[PDB]
């Protein structure tokens, strides 16, 4: 591939999520992870992960709630434009 794929939740506590994805075959400057309570509609949180990594923890989630998680691969303007819709998933904590 050429953009991140196979995003999924590896482990989980009531308050934390550890996630992983299969990196794209490309220099990735870094990633952005965004999460938010699913269809809650509020602003989402976002944080950055170094491009050599391909997993991230998410913490301080409200136990038993359903979050939407989305992983953004930050490359360059051109690739990002050319690139596909980012992969996202839903996971209830």
């Amino acid at each position: 591939s050429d953009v991140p794929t196979k995003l999924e939740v590896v482990a989980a506590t009531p308050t934390s999520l550890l996630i992983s994805w299969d990196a794209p075959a490309v220099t990735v400057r870094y990633y952005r992870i965004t999460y938010g309570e699913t269809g809650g509609n509020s602003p989402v949180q976002e944080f950055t992960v170094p491009g050599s990594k391909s997993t991230a923890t998410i913490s301080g989630l409200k136990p038993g709630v359903d979050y939407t998680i989305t992983v953004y691969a930050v490359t360059g303007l051109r690739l990002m434009l050319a690139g596909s819709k980012p992969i996202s998933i839903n996971y209830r904590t």
Binding site: G76, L77, L81
Partner: protein, 233 residues
């Protein structure tokens, strides 16, 4: 083409759905406001928003039908204008302050932490107020955004020029639908388009400020923002 078959109601619905997600800033109150820390804060927010700006753009009707070279160009040109028009929209209901984000409500003195900032702030405020004062509606606003994206730059592109005249018709349709007379219609159309000028201007002043901050080497900027800036000189 498909962006041309869309009725105004359809056109507006599309843009209304393509809206980027609202973002929290990295504001932290254990560390006090320094020139370094606030620029880092604003500058971090900007990098964030840019990532969504890209995917928002693609969803703007007819945009993804341009050569990738043109899609790039429009964005290298428009990003700060887009950023600004959003801030100014977001701040309309806050006479006096700028709602950079749900957790970042700055007002005018907070800006003169950073040298060069306050002048741009004053304008962002003035413009904000002007929109509030003419009761800009969310439906007009998304149109403005798009025009800003599509109108950035120069000629060497008549594709771009049709989908703009579309957006214009949409605009005019809204006003009509909102109970204006023909003369009040064209008048308000003109009033909004004149404002776009002020944003180009604010955008230019900001961009130079941002550039001077990169050199002075106050704060470090992320790879993406860094590109959007260097795209300008």
């Amino acid at each position: 083409s498909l962006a041309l078959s869309l009725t105004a109601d359809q056109m507006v619905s599309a843009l209304l759905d393509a809206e980027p997600p609202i973002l929290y800033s990295e504001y932290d109150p254990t560390r006090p406001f320094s020139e370094a820390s606030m620029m880092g804060l604003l500058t971090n927010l900007a990098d964030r928003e840019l990532v969504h700006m890209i995917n928002w753009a693609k969803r703007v009707p007819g945009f993804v039908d341009l050569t990738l070279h043109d899609q790039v160009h429009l964005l290298e040109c428009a990003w700060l204008e887009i950023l600004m028009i959003g801030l100014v929209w977001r701040s309309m209901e806050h006479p006096g302050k700028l709602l950079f984000a749900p957790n970042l409500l700055l007002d005018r003195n907070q800006g003169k932490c950073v040298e060069g900032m306050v002048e741009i702030f004053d304008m962002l405020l003035a413009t904000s107020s002007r929109f509030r004062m003419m009761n800009l509606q969310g439906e007009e606003f998304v149109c403005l955004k798009s025009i800003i994206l599509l109108n950035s730059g120069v000629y060497t592109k008549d594709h771009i020029h049709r989908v703009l005249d579309k957006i214009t018709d949409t605009l005019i349709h809204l006003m009509a639908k909102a109970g204006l007379t023909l003369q009040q219609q064209h008048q308000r159309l003109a009033q909004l388009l004149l404002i776009l000028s002020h944003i180009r201007h604010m955008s230019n002043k900001g961009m130079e400020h941002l550039y001077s901050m990169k050199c002075k080497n106050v704060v470090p900027l992320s790879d993406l923002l860094l590109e959007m800036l260097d795209a300008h000189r």
